């Protein structure tokens, strides 16, 4: 439903972060806590936080 | 009414692309820092980043 794509690479700064490559796609699970969103990577299935200025809607 | 301070190329279909100097009518600024706007140059509607613009 709510799909986003990474515009840049990101290396996790903490265990609860998701690392990802540019072009990776995400399902957003929770965006209500701030500018870091909980998401599910559609390439790896891993869940974690991502910075919402590193992505754009698909 | 707002004016663009920089160029911006859309990152998604629902974004507006625009040039510096372009003018806008804001249609919806209630969803966050991306506002839905109408370009007064093209009539095209879409979201723009609200730090790329200044009030006219």
């Amino acid at each position: 439903v709510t799909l986003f794509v990474a515009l840049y690479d990101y290396e996790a700064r903490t265990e609860d972060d998701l690392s990802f490559h540019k072009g990776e796609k995400f399902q957003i699970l929770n965006s209500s806590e701030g500018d870091w969103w909980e998401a599910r990577s559609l390439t790896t299935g891993e869940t974690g936080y991502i910075p919402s200025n590193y992505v754009a809607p698909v | 009414l707002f004016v663009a301070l920089y160029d911006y190329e859309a990152r998604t279909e629902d974004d507006l692309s625009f040039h510096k100097g372009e003018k806008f009518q804001i249609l919806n600024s209630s969803e966050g820092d991306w506002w839905e706007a109408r370009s007064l140059t093209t009539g095209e509607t879409g979201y723009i980043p609200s730090n790329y613009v200044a009030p006219v």
Partner: peptide, 10 residues
């Protein structure tokens, strides 16, 4: 050209 702001909530 400045950094873009975080996207709006889905």
């Amino acid at each position: 050209a400045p950094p873009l702001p975080p996207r709006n909530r889905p």
